[PDB]
Design a binder for these strands. Structure first.
Lengths: 116, 110, 57
RNA sequence: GGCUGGACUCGUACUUCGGUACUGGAGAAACAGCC
């Protein structure tokens, strides 16, 4: 059933656009909340953004708006960092809210991105 | 816009002691708080949802209470695997206050 | 205005719960509407909760 | 978890008074099943 696996994590110079992908498998639901959460190494969890799968509805934090673009493909969900900076260097998890009640039940293992 | 202030940053306890973590919401989130546990090297996992309700596959020693904007995670009997960082999450993606995480807590058992 | 984007999300939630097939036994469609009412009840709780955030108190 | 609907007991309306249609009518958020 429910499983999420993300990829794309690299090391890139600043200003180098970067696409992370979450492949989502085993979901019986039409729509659900697909969230992107960020953690800098040694530091805490930071909610990047979220999308509602079936619709075109994307939402972001005040600090992330316009620097990140979440897109939805039939099996895929992409997080695009359009202008990374060295403070964007972190691990990125995708999380899933199946109940649409706001809590993250299912996480991916995460990916690691470095910016230098 | 939403800001979760997680009051205790670090708490150490001898086994069998009660730890009380508190989150303060910058706005009324009602039932929209959820508590998460993360251990080094691995993604987090659900502990509490809708602020009082224990998640599946979780030991029952975890408690939580909404009171207004003050929310509490209370662990009574502590154990060793309780060494981990804990976060509170609050809000909803489509709410005018977008979902926000607390600063985090570190729990190490002596 | 993100209240608008929220409302479009809501409409997309109410439309994810399509009406039942009108053709069928009288109590077959009683059960169809019975299960449809639960889903519409969750959607109503969620959407009312969201809409309160932009209007509310 | 996802889907399905069956015997009844009633409540309305109109009945050539035996019957019918009705779930923004009720028992039924029951009950019984299928994947």
């Amino acid at each position: 059933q429910e499983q999420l696996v993300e990829s794309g994590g690299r090391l890139v110079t600043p200003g180098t656009a970067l696409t992370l992908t979450c492949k989502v498998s085993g979901f019986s639901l039409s729509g659900f909340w697909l969230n992107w959460v960020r953690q800098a190494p040694g530091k805490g969890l930071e909610w990047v953004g979220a999308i509602y799968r079936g619709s075109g509805s994307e939402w972001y934090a005040s600090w992330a708006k316009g620097r990140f673009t979440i897109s939805d493909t039939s099996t895929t969900v992409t997080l695009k960092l359009t202008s990374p900076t060295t403070e964007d260097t972190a691990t990125y998890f995708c999380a899933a809210d199946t109940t649409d009640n706001g809590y993250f039940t299912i996480w991916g293992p995460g990916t690691l991105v470095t910016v230098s | 816009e939403l800001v979760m202030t997680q009051t205790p940053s670090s708490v150490s306890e001898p086994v069998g002691g009660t730890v009380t973590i508190k989150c303060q919401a910058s706005q009324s989130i009602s039932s929209w708080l959820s508590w998460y546990q993360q251990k080094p090297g691995q993604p987090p996992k659900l502990l509490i949802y809708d602020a009082s309700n224990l998640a599946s596959g979780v030991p029952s020693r975890f408690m939580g209470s909404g009171s207004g904007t003050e929310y509490t995670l209370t662990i009574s009997g502590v154990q060793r695997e309780d060494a981990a960082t804990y976060y509170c999450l609050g809000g909803y993606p489509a709410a005018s206050y977008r979902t926000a995480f607390g600063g985090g807590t570190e729990l190490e058992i002596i | 205005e993100d209240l608008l984007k929220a409302v479009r999300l809501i409409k997309f939630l109410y439309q994810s719960n399509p009406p039942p097939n009108p053709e069928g036994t009288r109590q077959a469609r009683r059960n169809r509407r019975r299960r449809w009412r639960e889903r519409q009840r969750q959607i109503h709780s969620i959407s009312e909760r969201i809409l309160s955030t932009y209007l509310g108190r």
